[PDB]
Design an enzyme around this catalytic site. Sequence first.
Site, PDB file in Angstrom:
ATOM      1  N   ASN A   1     -33.105  35.489  12.009  1.00 29.41           N
ATOM      2  CA  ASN A   1     -34.380  34.918  12.415  1.00 29.41           C
ATOM      3  C   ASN A   1     -34.508  34.975  13.928  1.00 29.41           C
ATOM      4  OD1 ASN A   1     -36.530  32.902  13.138  1.00 29.41           O
ATOM      5  ND2 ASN A   1     -36.479  32.486  10.925  1.00 29.41           N
TER       6      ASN A   1
ATOM      7  N   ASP B   1     -35.305  32.685  15.780  1.00 26.34           N
ATOM      8  CA  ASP B   1     -34.746  31.485  16.382  1.00 26.34           C
ATOM      9  C   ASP B   1     -33.228  31.516  16.471  1.00 26.34           C
ATOM     10  OD1 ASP B   1     -33.774  30.733  13.787  1.00 26.34           O
ATOM     11  OD2 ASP B   1     -35.695  29.742  13.356  1.00 26.34           O
TER      12      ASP B   1
ATOM     13  N   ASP C   1     -30.112  34.138   7.611  1.00 23.68           N
ATOM     14  CA  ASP C   1     -30.186  33.889   6.174  1.00 23.68           C
ATOM     15  C   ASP C   1     -29.145  34.747   5.465  1.00 23.68           C
ATOM     16  OD1 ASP C   1     -32.484  32.252   6.530  1.00 23.68           O
ATOM     17  OD2 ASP C   1     -33.755  34.053   6.452  1.00 23.68           O
TER      18      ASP C   1
ATOM     19  N   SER D   1     -30.976  31.746  13.940  1.00 20.15           N
ATOM     20  CA  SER D   1     -30.288  31.486  12.692  1.00 20.15           C
ATOM     21  C   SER D   1     -30.271  32.752  11.840  1.00 20.15           C
ATOM     22  CB  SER D   1     -30.953  30.329  11.945  1.00 20.15           C
ATOM     23  OG  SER D   1     -32.309  30.600  11.647  1.00 20.15           O
TER      24      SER D   1
ATOM     25  N   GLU E   1     -35.944  37.279  -2.287  1.00 17.73           N
ATOM     26  CA  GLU E   1     -35.154  36.964  -1.104  1.00 17.73           C
ATOM     27  C   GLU E   1     -34.191  38.093  -0.745  1.00 17.73           C
ATOM     28  OE1 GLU E   1     -35.623  34.691   0.933  1.00 17.73           O
ATOM     29  OE2 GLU E   1     -36.710  33.061  -0.018  1.00 17.73           O
TER      30      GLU E   1
ATOM     31  N   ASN F   1     -30.037  29.606   4.936  1.00 17.71           N
ATOM     32  CA  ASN F   1     -30.147  29.646   6.393  1.00 17.71           C
ATOM     33  C   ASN F   1     -29.084  28.820   7.104  1.00 17.71           C
ATOM     34  OD1 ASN F   1     -31.537  28.401   9.084  1.00 17.71           O
ATOM     35  ND2 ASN F   1     -32.249  30.479   8.685  1.00 17.71           N
TER      36      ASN F   1
ATOM     37  N   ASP G   1     -33.953  18.787  -1.183  1.00 15.14           N
ATOM     38  CA  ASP G   1     -34.287  18.281   0.150  1.00 15.14           C
ATOM     39  C   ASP G   1     -35.695  17.713   0.236  1.00 15.14           C
ATOM     40  OD1 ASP G   1     -36.209  20.373   0.623  1.00 15.14           O
ATOM     41  OD2 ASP G   1     -34.970  21.382   2.103  1.00 15.14           O
TER      42      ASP G   1
END
Length: 129
Positions: A46, A48, A52, A50, A35, A59, A101
Amino acid sequence: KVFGRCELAAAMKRHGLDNYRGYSLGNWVCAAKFESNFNTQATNRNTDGSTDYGILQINSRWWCNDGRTPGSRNLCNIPCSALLSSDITASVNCAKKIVSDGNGMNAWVAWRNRCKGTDVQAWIRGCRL
Ligand SMILES: CC[C@@H]1CN2CCc3cc(OC)c(OC)cc3[C@H]2C[C@H]1C[C@@H]1NCCc2cc(OC)c(OC)cc21
């Protein structure tokens, strides 16, 4: 901070990641390697909108607040900048929520694609832990 491999393994173990949700320490070290390359200051934006953050590239759409991710939540109740600290506590505490999650460590796509099913224990061998 760019952690050494064994230094990060030790810090994750002290903060309770070894066998957390059944994932041995090498899985966490491997995920951090791919990562962030062990760099606490890693960020990646990202498409979109967002971002990280940190050693485990957590995120902003769900997990932290950075004030610039439209429609997002803050389920770890932390500023995303707290995930860039040289102290990995905030990243570990938030990672514990993420891995809960329902998808386990598949929540980290780099873990699923580059660590899952490998000899992840190689990441902690030779480390004083
Ligand atoms: C003690 C050796 C390091 C630990 N391993 C853990 C297993 C592993 C798995 C990988 O992919 C799944 C992987 O991909 C990059 C690496 C590792 C390694 C990382 C080891 C080797 C080490 N990393 C830092 C510096 C360095 C430099 C190297 O050459 C300059 C080198 O050559 C083999 C290895 C390494």
